[PDB]
Ligand binder design. Structure first.
Ligand SMILES: Nc1ncnc2c1ncn2[C@@H]1O[C@H](COP(=O)(O)OP(=O)(O)OP(=O)(O)O)[C@@H](O)[C@H]1O
Ligand SMILES: Nc1ncnc2c1ncn2[C@@H]1O[C@H](COP(=O)(O)OP(=O)(O)OP(=O)(O)O)[C@@H](O)[C@H]1O
Ligand SMILES: [Mg+2]
Lengths: 193, 53, 102, 264, 194
């Protein structure tokens, strides 16, 4: 191997949580989307600094809705202001479903794995959250070849992990297939607070 | 379990332009759904469709 | 132009970004972050939807010497309109830490 | 009508024909380069319409839901970029409220109504109110048009050739055969001669008399002779205990007779 | 002649027969790239249509709030639904017909008022033409029919003079074959209302 492999604890800063929700709530009932800026340190610690949205050229969550020029142009802008950092995932919204990726959105996540090795797909529920707290879960997709020959348990150990059963059975099948899910935590500055 | 239903009309699924890729009113061949505008020469639909109620 | 604006209500997100932007550009006193302010106006209720950073350099030897990235602004204005059309240029923030005559 | 041969030397100076001949060395380069473009483009454009046909064949699989078309909206897909509908109104940006074009509201046989923007495979020059359409069950899209069909009981009434009696087994009663063929058989065959006379053909004949005189015989004969669609009907079959489904039987049987025309 | 330019013109005339060959192919391929792009408009629309969904039609039964509306759907059950934010809140009120996503049950967009498909079939019927010179014997009855049917359409100012209501509701009755169906068929092509 190259690493022992375990799924990321996402320390989503205040500005990024709040921003994904603004954009995705406005976008009800369409699929909404955009890219995540952050930095990857440790064996599982992804800090997501900001998000920025990807202008809809499709229906949302398509590869017709991800434009090469747009991607290029946004990056080129972020350098002037120092916000340029590497892409640590992408967000999207289902406002008709819980946190559970649909078949089309797996296909979008399969393309992101080529781009980035540790890219997450984060499902933001804008209205459908079932607790007082916002329900968001992050997923990563790794191949079926590791998971089937029984390397999935090893990957999920030495961490507290997260189990959800929001769509019950449907979730479990999906969860299994993709990879895993891990506790999501929030980074607060005392200026921000 | 097999639900009991009923035939209302036998529809022909080959040679009737069931595929409308060259039909627009009556511009369809109605002799092929096997090489009408197909990448294959062989069958792409069935011999018989039927209308169940 | 209109002077009919009796209140400004600002979203938590606008405040949080502009403030957040100050340390993302890693500026310290006597260097300025400014950004574009997007939102609704022409009304009494101003509703401040979003903001994005600009680069801003302040020289205070002469208050007639200033840096502003012109092209950046026009480009960015057009992209934001395709997510949501209610975003217009309604102003710019100055990062303080006080008012000036400048 | 030919040029550049020994005949043009007689007609015209030899100086003109040098400039005509040096030109055709240059002119053929236009034909040669531009032919490469079309033959190479015509292999790529021929690939485009087959590459989509391959996906058309994944959708076309059975079974699929049945619908009829409540109303074709027929909004204008392009007519401005200030709208995107048939309607034109002041102000640009009406967001995704303007996004209705050639559109079908279909009502399914689950007895619900959906709107969708149709598949242009099925043209809206087909669709009228009340046409049978297929609709894919998974996502309601008009998959195809189904030919309009009618109740299975009606379908049973159509002829399968009723035994020929000719007019050697309608023995006697000549005058009745004569009176009957004038009202039923001539307006089919000789339909042209009444149009000329400016009179209208009958709408029917009635046969009445005492039982056993072969009124039923003469019809059975008539079936064999005209070789058109003969819709057999028995009047107590038509009456039906479900409210006005007896009436549905009238209209369908006669609707059927429009199609299979000429009819008896 | 006895020229060598008599020979040159034979040699370039082999290019002029070759201009004719080129023309057959060039024009034939030009028109065929124009045919494969007509087909290309129907076979791309399947793909784009396949990226569309059906939307359960309902109607705003009655406003609760600005975020939450009550929509009763055309399948039975009443729902309490959300909004798209393009949908104008002053255009959403009781009677109006709306469409709803099958995934989210969200008010997608407004539609014009809708009617049963049986009643569209009733207005289709009316073909050909009959005038009141194809009716005879009934010139008295033609006038009392027009007294009720033509006049308040043209001018209800006549009925207003007297201070009396306009009539509506005509019953025609007769022994069969008196032309009672005929009388109405003729007046349907004349009056020029629906
Ligand atoms: N003129 C005739 N020539 C030949 N056969 C006849 C003649 N009249 C009647 N028949 C025979 O008598 C049989 C029985 O009569 P059929 O039932 O056809 O009579 P109908 O008067 O139409 O009766 P109903 O009104 O009672 O149904 C016929 O099927 C036929 O074989
Ligand atoms: N008043 C009339 N003047 C001229 N032609 C007439 C008149 N009445 C009937 N006819 C002719 O006879 C035809 C048949 O009559 P039609 O079927 O319209 O009658 P009806 O009295 O409406 O019938 P039903 O009782 O079956 O409802 C007409 O189409 C027309 O050619
Ligand atoms: Mg009548």
């Amino acid at each position: 191997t190259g690493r022992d492999d375990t799924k990321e604890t996402v320390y989503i800063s205040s500005i990024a949580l709040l921003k994904m929700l603004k954009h995705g709530r406005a976008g009800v009932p369409m699929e909404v989307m955009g890219l995540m800026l952050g930095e990857f340190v440790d064996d599982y610690t992804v800090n997501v600094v900001d998000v920025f949205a990807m202008p809809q050229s499709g229906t949302g969550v398509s590869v017709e809705a991800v434009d090469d020029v747009f991607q290029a142009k946004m990056m080129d802008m972020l350098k002037q202001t120092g916000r340029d950092q590497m892409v640590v995932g992408w967000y999207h919204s289902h406002p008709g479903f819980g946190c559970w990726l649909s078949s089309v959105d797996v296909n979008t996540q399969k393309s992101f794995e080529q781009l980035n090795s540790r890219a997450v797909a984060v499902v933001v529920d804008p209205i459908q959250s079932v607790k007082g707290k916002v329900v968001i879960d992050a997923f990563r997709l790794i191949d079926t070849g590791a998971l089937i020959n029984n390397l999935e348990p090893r990957q999920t150990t030495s961490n507290t992990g997260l189990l959800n059963k929001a769509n019950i059975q449907a979730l479990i099948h999906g969860l299994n297939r993709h990879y895993y899910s891990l506790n999501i935590d929030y980074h607060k500055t005392a200026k921000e607070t | 379990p097999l639900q009991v239903a009923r035939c209302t009309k036998i529809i022909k699924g080959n040679g009737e332009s069931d595929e409308t890729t060259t039909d627009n009113n009556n511009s369809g061949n109605s002799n092929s759904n096997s090489n009408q505008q197909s990448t294959d020469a062989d069958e792409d639909d069935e011999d018989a469709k039927y209308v169940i109620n | 132009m209109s002077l009919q604006h009796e209140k400004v209500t600002i979203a938590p997100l606008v405040l949080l970004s502009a403030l957040d932007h100050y340390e993302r550009t890693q500026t310290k006193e006597n260097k300025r972050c400014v950004g574009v302010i997007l939102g609704d106006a022409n009304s009494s209720t101003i509703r401040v939807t979003n903001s994005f950073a600009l680069p801003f350099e302040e020289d205070e030897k002469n208050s007639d010497v200033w840096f502003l990235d012109h092209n950046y602004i026009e480009n960015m204005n057009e992209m934001c309109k395709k997510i949501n059309a209610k975003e217009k240029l309604i102003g710019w923030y100055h990062s303080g830490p006080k008012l000036r005559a400048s | 009508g030919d040029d550049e041969l020994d005949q043009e030397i007689l007609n015209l100076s030899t100086q003109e024909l040098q400039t005509r001949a040096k030109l055709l060395d240059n002119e053929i380069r236009i034909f040669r380069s531009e032919l490469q473009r079309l033959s190479h483009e015509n292999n790529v454009m021929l690939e485009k319409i087959k590459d989509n046909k391959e996906k058309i064949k994944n959708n076309r699989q059975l079974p699929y839901l049945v619908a009829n078309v409540v109303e074709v909206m027929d909004m204008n897909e392009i007519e401005d970029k200030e709208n995107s509908e048939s309607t034109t109104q002041g102000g640009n940006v009406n967001l995704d409220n303007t996004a209705v074009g050639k559109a079908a509201v279909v009502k399914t046989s689950s007895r619900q109504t959906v709107f969708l923007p149709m598949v242009g495979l099925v043209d809206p020059d087909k669709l009228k109110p009340n046409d049978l359409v297929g609709v894919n069950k998974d996502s309601y899209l008009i998959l195809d048009t189904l030919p309009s069909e009618f109740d299975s009981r009606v379908k049973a009434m159509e002829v399968d050739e009723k035994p020929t009696e000719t007019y050697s087994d309608v023995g006697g009663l000549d005058k009745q055969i004569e009176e009957l063929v004038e009202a039923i058989v001539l307006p089919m065959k000789r339909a042209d001669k009444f149009k000329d006379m400016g009179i209208r053909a009958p709408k029917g004949a009635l046969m009445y008399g005492p039982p056993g005189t072969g009124k039923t015989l003469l019809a059975r004969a008539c079936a064999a002779q005209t070789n058109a669609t003969f819709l057999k009907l028995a009047a107590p079959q038509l009456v039906q205990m479900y409210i006005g489904e007896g009436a549905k039987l009238v209209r369908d049987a006669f609707a059927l007779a429009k199609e299979k025309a000429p009819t008896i | 002649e006895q020229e060598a330019h008599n020979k040159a013109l034979n040699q370039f005339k082999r290019k002029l027969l070759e201009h004719r060959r080129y023309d057959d192919q060039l024009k034939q391929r030009r028109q065929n790239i124009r045919d494969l792009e007509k087909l290309y408009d129907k076979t791309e629309n399947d793909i784009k249509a396949l990226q569309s969904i059906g939307q359960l039609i309902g109607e705003v039964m009655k406003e609760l709030s600005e975020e939450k509306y009550i929509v009763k759907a055309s399948s039975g059950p009443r729902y309490i639904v959300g909004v798209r934010n393009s949908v104008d809140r002053s255009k959403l009120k009781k009677g109006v017909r709306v469409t709803l996503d099958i995934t989210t049950l969200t008010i997608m967009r407004i539609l014009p008022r809708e009617t049963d498909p049986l009643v569209y079939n009733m207005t289709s019927f009316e073909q050909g033409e009959i005038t009141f010179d194809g009716i005879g014997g009934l010139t008295e009855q033609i006038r009392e029919l027009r007294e009720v049917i033509e006049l308040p359409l043209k001018n209800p100012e006549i009925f207003q003079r007297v201070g009396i209501k306009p009539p509506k509701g005509v019953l025609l009755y007769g022994p069969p074959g008196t032309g009672k169906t005929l009388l109405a068929k003729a007046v349907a092509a004349t009056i020029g209302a629906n």
